Design a protein around this ligand. Sequence first.
Ligand code: HEM
Ligand code: HEM
Ligand code: NIZ
Ligand code: NIZ
Ligand code: CL
Ligand code: CL
Ligand code: NA
Ligand code: NA
Lengths: 713, 713
Amino acid sequence: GTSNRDWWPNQLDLSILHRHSSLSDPMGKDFNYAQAFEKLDLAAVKRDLHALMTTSQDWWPADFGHYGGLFIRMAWHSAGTYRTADGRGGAGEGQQRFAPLNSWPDNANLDKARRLLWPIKQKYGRAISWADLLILTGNVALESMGFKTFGFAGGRADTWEPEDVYWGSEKIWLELSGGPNSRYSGDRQLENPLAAVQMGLIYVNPEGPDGNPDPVAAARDIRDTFARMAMNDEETVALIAGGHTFGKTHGAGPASNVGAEPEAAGIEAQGLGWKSAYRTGKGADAITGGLEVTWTTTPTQWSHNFFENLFGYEWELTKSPAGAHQWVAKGADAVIPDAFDPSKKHRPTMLTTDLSLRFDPAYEKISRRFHENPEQFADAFARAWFKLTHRDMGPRARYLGPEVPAEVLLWQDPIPAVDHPLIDAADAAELKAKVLASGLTVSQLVSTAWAAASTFRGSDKRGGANGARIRLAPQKDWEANQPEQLAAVLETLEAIRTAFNGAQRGGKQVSLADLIVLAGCAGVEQAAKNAGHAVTVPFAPGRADASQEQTDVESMAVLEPVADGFRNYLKGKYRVPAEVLLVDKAQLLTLSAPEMTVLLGGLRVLGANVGQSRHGVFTAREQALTNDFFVNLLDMGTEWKPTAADADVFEGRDRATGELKWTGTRVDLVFGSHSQLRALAEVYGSADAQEKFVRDFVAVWNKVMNLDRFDLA
Amino acid sequence: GTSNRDWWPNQLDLSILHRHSSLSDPMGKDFNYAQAFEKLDLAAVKRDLHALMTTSQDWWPADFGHYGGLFIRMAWHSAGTYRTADGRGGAGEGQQRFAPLNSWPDNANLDKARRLLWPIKQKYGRAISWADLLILTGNVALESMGFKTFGFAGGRADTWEPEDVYWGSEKIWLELSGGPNSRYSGDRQLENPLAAVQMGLIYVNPEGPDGNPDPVAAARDIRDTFARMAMNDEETVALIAGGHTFGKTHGAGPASNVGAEPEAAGIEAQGLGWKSAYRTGKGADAITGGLEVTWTTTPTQWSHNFFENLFGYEWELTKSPAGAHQWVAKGADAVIPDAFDPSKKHRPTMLTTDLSLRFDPAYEKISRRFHENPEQFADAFARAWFKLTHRDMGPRARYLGPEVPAEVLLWQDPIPAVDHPLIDAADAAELKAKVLASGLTVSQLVSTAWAAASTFRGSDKRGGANGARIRLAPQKDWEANQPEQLAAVLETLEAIRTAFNGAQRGGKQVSLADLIVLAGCAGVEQAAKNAGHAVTVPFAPGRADASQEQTDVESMAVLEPVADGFRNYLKGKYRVPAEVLLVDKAQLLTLSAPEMTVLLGGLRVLGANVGQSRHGVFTAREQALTNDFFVNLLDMGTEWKPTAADADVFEGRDRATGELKWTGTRVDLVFGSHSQLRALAEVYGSADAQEKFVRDFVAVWNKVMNLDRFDLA
Ligand code: HEM
Ligand code: HEM
Ligand SMILES: NNC(=O)c1ccncc1
Ligand SMILES: NNC(=O)c1ccncc1
Ligand SMILES: [Cl-]
Ligand SMILES: [Cl-]
Ligand code: NA
Ligand code: NA
């Protein structure tokens, strides 16, 4: 059946905003996963997982009698899709069990690993999510094999449909770079937001770049991809050598023996895939990725044998039984055990990308230090494994259970505890009046609070107004945030704050993070007043102020908005049309299409545009909260044309006289073009809509202000 | 950006069950359109519409100074997408304003028509839907031009995103038959559920079949497509001749002048399309469909001139200025007015498909009768226009406002009014005990109520248990309904009924329609008890029993389930895989995917399969309401393979011994295969889920039993 996507393949896709409705969720509307998890007997779960590690099933026999390696790779892959550019991917939604990730070639035979876990998932039911279970199982694997983990937090709620994620434009799995949809350009520059080198890989190609088995060049791909997954050199070497302390690869025969990935397999395969015609198709005959490497002499026990081997031998380029490039230790004895036959042994082997850790000079220094000091290695790996597996979980307040680490890590964007009474409703009212009396405008107040709160992204739950990080480097200098104007607003609010906190008794005080948000609230109330409407904008106190020392400035860089349609802002010229970027931002903000529409139309008339641009400011009463954006946008008395100076800016002229009425961007005019968005604009542009527009605006404003407020969950 | 649909294009699509969530709806959760409409000043709306008729806008000037013809075509097209096969299409959801319908070639320049209505829409806001407004406008157009309509009903709630409808498989607009995705096979057999001859047409090609200008052959396509849109010969002739009493076609120059349809046009076009480079691109120079025909001497006034012209001249084949085939009256004077130039007149013209009304022998007789008896023509057209425009509105209870016709029409599947007291909770308890004491089994009770209630489809709001039509022809003879078993259950229920009604005082009585549903409820209660659960199933009385004379047997045929996965039924071998048909049925039933899943799993263990098939009956306690379907389906101790005798049936064997445990269909096993459905099955197959399963099943059962209950809305 031909669909709208077939006829109009470049049209914007709003369905990405409407996933995760109560329609697709089997749990009741009131189900609270945190409450279910908090009563799980986590210790009992772990004991079952521990027993599972050495209980082999004949449909996928355990290598060396121990599934530990398989499960560690499973957990690593669950986490390893994460990209810092957008926060998308990661383990936090259990997306490995859905398309496309359940069928990525790099996830081959993890369908078996997930299936091994059904009996435990079935036992404990809604009290442990798949998302939590994947990571937990990886921790229990490492613990069972002698490795002390840094901790574990529950709280990743299950999701019930695939996320809409851009994974690249290629139409062939694993396509080598340089094709018609190449994700590389210039001098091996990977396009943002991607964080893998080929479609369907987690990070890099284990043979080397586009299959070229050069460890030095592979190292460049390793470093780039792992940085784009939030990991530095030390963390990267710790993770790869730590992982490859365990288990083995699977490449026992040619890959052409391996059948359809799960989403393409027949219905009788019951959600599994990659069925192999090679000998028994499993166990000793397994084929997963096509390499045949076993790193250590004790693949089911933590050791420092990965580095002993890496540095204790010289390596020769060889081929697996499937034809893949890999490396074997020159002159070595057969000291590596076989996974099924106790009378066979093998020489040490390595991937090209393992050798990267020795032949790249910066990695070499770290690998050497870890080799000489394996306790350093163990600590770095534990910390990195925790970071890896929790990177997308959000604020520490979301972390559940008895194994949460007490140490606060810089990468968490930590927020200090609040240790005083909070302001009450009367205090809030007093503060809003003092804000409005200072002479700060609706435009300043709205813009500042928008800038602070709208860094939040639901993808990894980073950002938001909690912390008052807008007053710190680097947020205070981002162009979208209007640095000079911001500095003036923050100076006024800080003087108001100092004066309020100085008059209190009893320890009550207000954080600047709360006051920024409250001041925006006051601005929205004043704008409503300016339009002849008395409304109260809800406000919840309890944010705290983080320090510069608690703020990693480089990690913060990925939250810079280079495109923010809600402020009519685009930092440069991109390949993706601005309206697509608007919908992408709305998704990150967790907005629906109605919420996006209301919010943008309100912001336009409140003066929230960067640089006071008149684009989309379709009103003669700016700073009054009215539906004028919609009524004027939809007025058929106005004709629109692109400008000669810029195809992305449009002039709205009176159709009869030619007089210039307005200018707008693509982000403005999409609301009058896109058939679904224009239907939403019509509701808010109707003569009966002023009350609705105000109410719905206030509601979405408050939703945005509270996006990071997991302390109130 | 490559998507799951690109990688796995034949995978089932569940998003069709989750469209129309509260996320995409701008109205609040409690918005009730009926209540808004009942407060509309309908008379004021009609006055505005009357004014609009002759208020020409320069951006799309009115032909003859009157937009009545354009609006009539607009309403006719809104309604004209309807297919009796699935009840999809029609005017009842205002889908003409969304893709793909807003951009169909046959809807060219109806974008202008809808835009002319914006000011009225804006004025009256949520109190008149677009869906109602399109039809109302068409009525006002007819009234303005002198034609008295049969009535009008409001109540078509607006929808907020495109429906997922199969409109065909062609990848080229207007593709002629016989291509790689032909909708025709055999001797010009149009594939079900389609009701148009080419992709993007309403019914037929106005030039003739695949462009061949033979009116006799065109008549065959007219008859088939209009029958597939619920219209017989009389109604068809009346509608086409009635419609073509007004207005004109537009084909002033070559079609190559016409640019992109709305979904493809630039953002500056602000939701319009088909901008034309021919002369002024509008008005006298309009190009819509490429023909250049004006039927009558008074195109803005009701007349009897259509049949005078059809029969009063002989016709000659000619070409329009765009090159399309059309017909001109031989020897005629220039009697037809020009739409813009008072000094020009034209000869009478006709489409090939107009000539069909004279040259097909069955139409000729009707056309003659209408020509000789114009009052009969007028009355038939009024009734047919009412039917056309209300066909998908459902039961009369949904009809709103002061212009609803009092006459009850056969096509409405009418339900008699209830004129006596209803049974109360004590009576219900007594009737359920009598049902359970009669010896009717859980299987019989469930299957009967399922067969009665599950004929409902939300697409056109036909079917459901109200009316007790399961006891009449043709439902009582459908194979899916197990006629012999049904007749035995109905005889026992009728005897219960007769005995209860005979013991009453007052006029209290129970309809058979209510008792069928109540008896089903007792069966579910019994099944729950058999499993050890104490469950009361909700029941709402008030259904009435329709007569055979109130049940058009031919119109009922399209509700016959030829595929019903909920009873593991398939009447023949189809090209569409059965699990796609299951999702289709769920959509018609208004079910989400979690609802579909719970319902099917319960039905399987209750004995609702046709013929008592064991396929999917994954329990050793049939007739007890348990989650056994899920627990056994997901058991990895069973391996599944298609049978050698039939690729669509699967055997589930013990993995270790090879012993046969179960058999299933595609519909059964899709729940263990499709990654989203399996995630739902897991919830219900978990150790903590038995009570949730039972409660969710009761809820969905009740939902199905009440689908047609608009008397309680
Ligand atoms: C450059 C980065 C990495 C590359 C190219 C890579 C490559 C691979 C390959 C090709 C396999 C074999 C798949 C199969 O045939 O079964 C594998 C196995 C494995 N990897 Fe990695 N890996 C990388 C990083 C990591 C990380 C960061 C971890 C965890 C901290 C990890 C843990 C494992 C484990 C435990 C196995 C063994 C699985 C088993 O025993 O079934 N790897 N790796
Ligand atoms: C066999 C069925 C029919 C065919 C092939 C057909 C064909 C067409 C075509 C080709 C046009 C010209 C479109 C354009 O260039 O502007 C048209 C116009 C129109 N048709 Fe039909 N038609 C059919 C049935 C109907 C019916 C059932 C109605 C309403 C009851 C209707 C009412 C109209 C009216 C009023 C117009 C004039 C539009 C104007 O004045 O702008 N037609 N028809
Ligand atoms: N692809 N996923 C996201 O963008 C997202 C996920 C959860 N909340 C907001 C956004
Ligand atoms: N395409 N539309 C339908 O199938 C439908 C619409 C409303 N309720 C049930 C089904
Ligand atoms: Cl994601
Ligand atoms: Cl539809
Ligand atoms: Na994420
Ligand atoms: Na319909």
